[PDB]
Amino acid sequence: RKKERNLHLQKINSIIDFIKERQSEQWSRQERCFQFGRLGASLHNQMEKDEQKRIEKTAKQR
């Protein structure tokens, strides 16, 4: 009896342990696309600046 409960207790312990592991390990789909969003925004900062400088270059060319 006692050990049967202990078995169950450790079984669910290991279940939780695998779950909490994956909570930090997984890095879910949403995490990727969210970071891409951020990434993209900074790219668009460059888009704006670089295009402006490309225009500027042309203006300086003549």
Partner: peptide, 12 residues
């Protein structure tokens, strides 16, 4: 669709 969301100056 993902590709499209970048083209429009990245939208959330």
């Amino acid at each position: 669709s993902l590709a499209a969301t970048y083209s429009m100056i990245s939208l959330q």
